[PDB]
């Protein structure tokens, strides 16, 4: 995106900020011993990257 | 009031197996699900003016399908496989040459 | 044994921060005129062309 949309130089790009936030969580069931039922969480992420051009 | 032989036979069956049996001169029809073999044989003879050696039948249940949250079922059907006498005129299905 | 109390934020974070990936070191390789970087243990494979740089 930086090189195409912004017309920047790829050799100057540095990963300025990057982080991973939480997405929605799906819930499942794992059967355990003696009629117990435990919950299993399927987590997802939102990953955000901001590259910037600087000498 | 009056009975017509054409109310028993609904449609031909169009498939690879059916096309394979056309080469043998055996025809497959969907019949009304409460008819019997003798009735189907009489009806075919009357309609297509042809000799019939034997008629075989089979029921088939409908498939279950789910659309939004719960299953739904298709209709059950009864197929009739009709083999002609050895030397009778072929039946022209008018669009099923095989 | 069961945990008697829930851990405070500070105590949870002290132990949680020590779970981390170790970073491997990369050295330069010139194969087929192009320059790449591979871990030093894969130098022979890179020079013989057994490494797939995708």
């Amino acid at each position: 995106n930086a090189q195409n949309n912004g017309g920047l130089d790829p050799a100057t790009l540095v990963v300025a900020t990057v982080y991973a936030d939480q997405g929605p969580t799906a819930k499942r069931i794992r059967p355990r011993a003696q009629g117990r039922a435990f919950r299993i969480r399927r987590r997802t992420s939102h990953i955000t990257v901001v590259v910037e051009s600087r000498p | 009031t009056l009975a017509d032989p054409r109310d028993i036979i609904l449609a031909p069956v169009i498939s690879e197996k059916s096309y394979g049996l056309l080469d043998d001169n055996v025809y497959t029809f969907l019949v009304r699900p409460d008819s019997n073999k003798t009735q189907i044989k009489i009806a075919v003879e009357k309609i297509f003016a042809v000799k019939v050696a034997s008629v075989n039948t089979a029921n088939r249940q409908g498939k279950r399908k789910r659309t939004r949250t719960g299953y739904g079922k298709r209709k059950s059907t009864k197929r009739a496989i009709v083999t002609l006498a050895p030397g009778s005129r072929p039946i022209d299905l008018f669009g099923a040459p095989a | 044994a069961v945990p008697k109390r829930r851990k405070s934020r500070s105590n949870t974070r002290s132990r949680r921060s020590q779970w981390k990936a170790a970073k491997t070191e990369l050295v330069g390789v010139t194969v087929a005129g192009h320059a790449h970087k591979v871990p030093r243990r894969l130098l022979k494979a890179a020079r013989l062309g057994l490494i797939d740089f995708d």
Partner: protein, 116 residues
């Protein structure tokens, strides 16, 4: 050779015997094998000793090799080509090269092959 220190490959040691023999057969048949690094490191001296028997090349050596290998085609090719090819080299008939690990279990991989 020197026995394994620690748990054997593939479970028991009756399995390790077969693993080593199969790896040796494949190596002599193809000249080059890709496998996990521990298996290749365990294979190296095992295969070098068979090559030494083939270099000696008598009927007793052939019987001794047939003790471990079961593929007569590979025995024949080892006694006809690999032995005479290495007649002028004093050990070090194989070479191990490390490769990128594989997905699934991140097992380290290596290739073992004869020198030429």
């Amino acid at each position: 050779p020197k026995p394994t220190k620690g748990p054997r490959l593939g479970g028991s040691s009756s399995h390790q015997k077969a693993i080593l023999a199969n790896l040796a057969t494949s190596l002599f048949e193809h000249g080059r094998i890709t496998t996990t690094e521990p298996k290749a490191r365990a294979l190296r001296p095992y295969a070098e000793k068979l090559i030494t028997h083939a270099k000696k090349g008598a009927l007793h050596n052939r019987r001794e090799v047939l003790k471990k290998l079961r593929d007569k085609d590979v025995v024949h090719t080892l006694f006809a080509e690999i032995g005479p090819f290495f007649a002028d080299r004093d050990g070090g008939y194989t070479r191990i090269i490390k490769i990128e690990a594989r997905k699934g279990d991140n097992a380290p991989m290596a290739v073992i092959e004869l020198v030429r």
